[PDB]
Symmetry: D2
Subunit: 193 residues, 4 copies
Amino acid sequence: TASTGFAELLKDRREQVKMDHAALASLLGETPETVAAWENGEGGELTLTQLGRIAHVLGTSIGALTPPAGNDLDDGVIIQMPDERPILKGVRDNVDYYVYNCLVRTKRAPSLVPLVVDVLTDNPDDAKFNSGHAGNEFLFVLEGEIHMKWGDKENPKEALLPTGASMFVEEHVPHAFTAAKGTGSAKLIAVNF
Amino acid sequence: TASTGFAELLKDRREQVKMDHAALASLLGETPETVAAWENGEGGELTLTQLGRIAHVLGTSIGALTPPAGNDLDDGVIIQMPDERPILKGVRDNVDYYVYNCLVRTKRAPSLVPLVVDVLTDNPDDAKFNSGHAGNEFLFVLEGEIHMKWGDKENPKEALLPTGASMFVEEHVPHAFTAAKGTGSAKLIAVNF
Amino acid sequence: TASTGFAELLKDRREQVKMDHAALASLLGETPETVAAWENGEGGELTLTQLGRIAHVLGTSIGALTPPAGNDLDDGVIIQMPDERDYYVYNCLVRTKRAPSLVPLVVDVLTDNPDDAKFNSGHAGNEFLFVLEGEIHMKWGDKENPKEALLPTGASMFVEEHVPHAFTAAKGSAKLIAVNF
Amino acid sequence: TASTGFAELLKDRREQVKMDHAALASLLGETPETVAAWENGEGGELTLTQLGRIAHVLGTSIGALTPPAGNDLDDGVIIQMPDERDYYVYNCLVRTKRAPSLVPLVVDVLTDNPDDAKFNSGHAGNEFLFVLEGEIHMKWGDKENPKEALLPTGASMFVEEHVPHAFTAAKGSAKLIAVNF
Ligand SMILES: C[C@H](O)CP(=O)(O)O
Ligand SMILES: C[C@H](O)CP(=O)(O)O
Ligand SMILES: C[C@H](O)CP(=O)(O)O
Ligand SMILES: C[C@H](O)CP(=O)(O)O
Ligand SMILES: [Co+2]
Ligand SMILES: [Co+2]
Ligand SMILES: [Co+2]
Ligand SMILES: [Co+2]
C-alpha cells in the first residue's frame, strides 16, 4: 500500500498543480506512460532519491506523497500482555544506566512510546543527562524512590520522588534519573507523547 | 493577562483585517476611544457575549483573540507528590464504579490527564460503558487483574488483562472496566492525551 | 452562541478532568448551581477576567472553552459582489469564518518614491501577491538593509510569515491583489 | 537531500523507540552495518516498498522519516515574472516549497454555455477566486442539483475544501484569478 498510497497521492498532487502525465514526465525526463504506471501503483521500485526529485518537481514533500502510518487496532483498541514486552539496554555514554521495557504502541499514535524504565544506578553524583528529546514525557514512580535532575547539568534543578509521584517533562528539557542515593534501584513508568 | 493577552491579540486581528479604531468601533456601536482602551488592556470586564460579537465582526473566534493556557513549569518541569493527589468519585449511571486519583497536569499540555484509577466492581456482567471520549488513552494495569470491554456494548470485544499489561484506546471508542470476576478490585494507570 | 458553545465545552472539559460541579465551584467562588447554570447556557455575562480564571483552574485556555468562528457559507461557498466592499487604500474582498486567516485585498499603492517607502513590522500569515496594474517596487527583510525588486504587471510574489515588507510604485501609482492566508 | 534528511529522521525515530542498530536490522533483513550506513546518508537507493517496510517496523509513516519540501525563498520571499509561467487554460503563478498548498493561477474560461459546464469532483484545500475579466457563471455542490451564481468583474468568492465546482462565462469568455491554499 505504500505504492498504492503513492499512486493516489501522486495523482492528486499532479492534479492540484494542473499537470497532465506529459507535463510531469518531461520535467522528470520520463515518458508519460511511466507516470501513468506510477499512478497505477507500479511505483514500488522508485528509490528514495527519485521520490525526492518527484517531490521537488511537484513543489512538496515526500511525506505529502506517501500514505499515513496505517491502522493496527482491533476496533480502535490494541493491547500488550506483560511477557510480550521487549527489552533494550540503556548505556549512557557507556555504563549500564537504564533498562527499557517497552509497552504497547500503535501506528495510529506514532509519538506514543510508553515504557517501564528500570533505573539501575543509585548514585545521584554520577547521573547521566540527556540533551533533551523531541516530545513531552509523563512519568510515574512505580517502585522505590527516584532522584531526578533537570535543566543545566552544570547546576540542575532536582527532586527526590517517592513511589506514586508523577512528573511532566517538556520537550527538549534535558533530564537524568538515578535511584535515591544508596537505595539500589528504582522503577518508573515513562510515557512519551 | 487574559485582558493583556486580549489587548495584544485584538490589536493584531484588527490590523490584519485593515481596520482602524473608528472602523471597528462603528461596526460594534462603540466609540474609537473604547476600542483603544481594550487594546490598552482595559477589556477585562467585557462579557462572553460581547467577546462573541467582537470575534464575529472580526471574522474569527474568541480563541483567536485570547492568549494560550500559560506556563506553570519550573524550568520545563512540574512534579506532583503522592499526597497532593486529588480524589473524585466515579458513579456510572449511579453505582460506585471507579475512584479517580488525579496525577500531575500542566497548562503547557492541557490534554494530558493522567490518573490512577481504582476499579471498584469485580463483576464483568454489570460493566458500565462510556459513550467514548475525545482523545487517546494509554492504560497500564497497576495492580490486580482487569476485565476490559470495548466497542458495541451490545456485543463487545473483551480482554482479561493481568498486572503489567498495557492498552491503547482510540478516541471516541466506548469502553468499560471492572476487576476480573470475583477478584474484588483492581487498579490501573490511565493517561489521556 | 458564545454562551451555548461555552456551555458544552465547559462541560466536556470539567468531565475531562474528572471534576463534578461541586469541585469546580469550590475553585471559582461560586455555588455548584451557578456552575450547572453556565453549562445550561447561562454563562453569557461572565467577564473576560472570569473566563480567564475558569480556564486557569481547568488547566487550559479560554479558546479551548469557546466555540470556533462559525459558518457563514452557503453549502460551502460565500460570494462578494464588487460593490459590497497616506500610503495605501484597501479594497477588502470576500472573507469567511471558516478560514479566518484568509484576508484578500485589492491594494492601491498611491506612492511612487521607493526611498519614501514605509515597512510594516511584519505580520502573521503568508501572503500571495499579484501586480494588477502599473509597476511595483518591492522591499523586504531589514528596513535598514532590505532586499528589493522591480515588479511589472502580471508579476506574482510570496512573502513568508513575519517577514517585514513595503511597496510603492516604481520611481516616477500601482494596483495589486494581495492575499493573506 | 532526501538521503540526508532520512538519515537524521531515521536515527531520531530509532532512538525514540529505544532500538539499537541490531534490533532494527533484525526486523528488515539487513545487517546492523547497513542500518548504520543509512543513518550515514547511504539510504538513497532504498525503494518506496522498502521505505514502507522501514516506517512500518518503526510504527510510523514514510513522511515522518523524510524531510519537508525545503526552502526556495530569498530571505523569506520568492518572485515570478509574468513571462516565466477544452475547458480552461491555466497560467500558473508563483509557487513555493515553504507552503506547498499554495497554488495561484490566472484561469481563462473559454466556454460560455452554463448547461455545458463540467464539475470537478471537488479538491483538497480552500480556494479564493476573483473575476479578473468578463462575467462568470459559477456552479457548486451536487452536479445534479447545484447552486449557481452570476459573478461580474471584480467579484470575489471562496469555495471550501472538497466542495465540487464548475465555471463558464455567462451565457453568450472570462478570466479569473484562483488561489488554492
Ligand atoms: C526517563 C527518561 O526520560 C528515559 P530517556 O528519555 O532519557 O531515554
Ligand atoms: C478508564 C477509563 O478510561 C476511565 P474513563 O475515561 O471512562 O472515565
Ligand atoms: C501597510 C503595511 O505597511 C503593509 P501591509 O498591511 O499591506 O502588509
Ligand atoms: C477544472 C476543474 O474542472 C476545476 P479546477 O481545477 O479549476 O478547480
Ligand atoms: Co526522557
Ligand atoms: Co477512558
Ligand atoms: Co502584507
Ligand atoms: Co478549484
